[PDB]
Structure 1
Amino acid sequence: LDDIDRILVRELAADGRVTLSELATRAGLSVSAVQSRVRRLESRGVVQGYSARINPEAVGHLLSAFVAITPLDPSQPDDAPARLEHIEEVESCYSVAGEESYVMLVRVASARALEDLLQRIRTTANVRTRSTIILNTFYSDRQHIP
C-alpha cells in the first residue's frame, strides 16, 4: 500500500464514518481522487465493511463461546464452513492448525440455546463440537494499522 492508501486506511480504521472531504483534507487529495481510492480499497478487499460494532449482550446474546469442530469423517473434504454459514449465531469461522479443524465464535441467548445450537451444528455439518465458553470480553475488534 502506498503512502496515501495507508493514510486512508488508517483513518477509516480509526472511524468508518470519516467523510470523503475529511479524508481528502487529511490525505492531501481532492474529494474525487479519494472517492476513487476508497472504492478501490473496497473492491480489492482492503476495506471489508463498515458495520458499527454492537454489544452482543445488548441485543440478547448473553452467552458467547468459541466452538471447535472436527469433521466426523476427516478423510473426505468436509466443507464445514460453507455448510454452516447460514447459521446466524456463527459470527466467524476459521480453519486452524492443531487438534481441531475449525474454530467458530458463537453467540446465543442462553445455555439451553447453546446446547441446541451445538446439536444443530453437529447435524448440519456432520462434525463434533468442543465448546469453550467466554466469561468476559475484556476488549475486542482492535485493529492494528502499522
Structure 2
Amino acid sequence: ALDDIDRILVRELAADGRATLSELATRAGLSVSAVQSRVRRLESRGVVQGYSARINPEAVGHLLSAFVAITPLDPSQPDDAPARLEHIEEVESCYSVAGEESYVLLVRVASARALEDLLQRIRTTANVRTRSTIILNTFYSDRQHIP
C-alpha cells in the first residue's frame, strides 16, 4: 500500500535521511503536518526501518572487511546462529542464503590478526565452519533504489 506521495517521501529520505519536514512538504506538495503523519505511518508499518549516518569504516579503524559464509557443524537442532552472533559487534550484517552454506556475514575488523581472532569467536559461538572472502575495495554501496 505505497501511493505516489509515499514513494516521493521514501525516495527523498533514502537520498537524505535528514531532509527536514518543511523540505519534504514542499517537495510532495503537502502541509508539514501531513508529511509528519505520512512519515510516522511509514515508520510504524515497517517501511522505514530507521535512520543512519553512513560512516567511512576506514576513518574509524576498520581497515579490513570480509564476507564470511557459515555452515552449522551439526544442522539437526534448529538454528540460533543469527541470535547467537548478534552479540559480536564486529558482525555488521547477517543473511540466510540458498545453496551450500547457510548464512553469509559481513564483518569488519582492524587487521589480519584481528580477523583471525574473530573467525575463532565465530566458529565457537555459533558452532559453524567458515569460508572467508576478504573485500579489497568497496566501489559503492547501499545505493537504495525505489522503483
TM-score between both structures, scaled by the size of structure 1: 0.97
| Displacement of 1:48 | 1.4
| Displacement of 1:10 | 1.1
Distance 1:137 1:25 in 2: 35
Partner of 2:86: 85
Report Cα offsets for 1:53-95 as digits up to 9, x if no partner.
Answer: 0111110000000000001111221210000011110010000
| Displacement of 1:145 | 1.0
Distance 1:138 1:4 in 2: 32
Q: Which runs of 4+ in 1 moved over 3 A?
A: none
Pairwise CA RMSD: 0.7
Where do 5+ consecutive residues of structure 1 fail to align? none
Distance 2:144 2:37 in 1: 24
TM-score between both structures, scaled by the size of structure 2: 0.97
| Displacement of 1:44 | 1.1
Identity among equivalent pairs (%)? 99
Where do 5+ consecutive residues of structure 2 fail to align? none
Superposed counterparts of 1:108-119, under 5 Å: 108-119=109-120
Report Cα offsets for 1:14-70 as digits up to 9, x if no partner.
Answer: 111111111111111111111011011111121112111011111000000000000
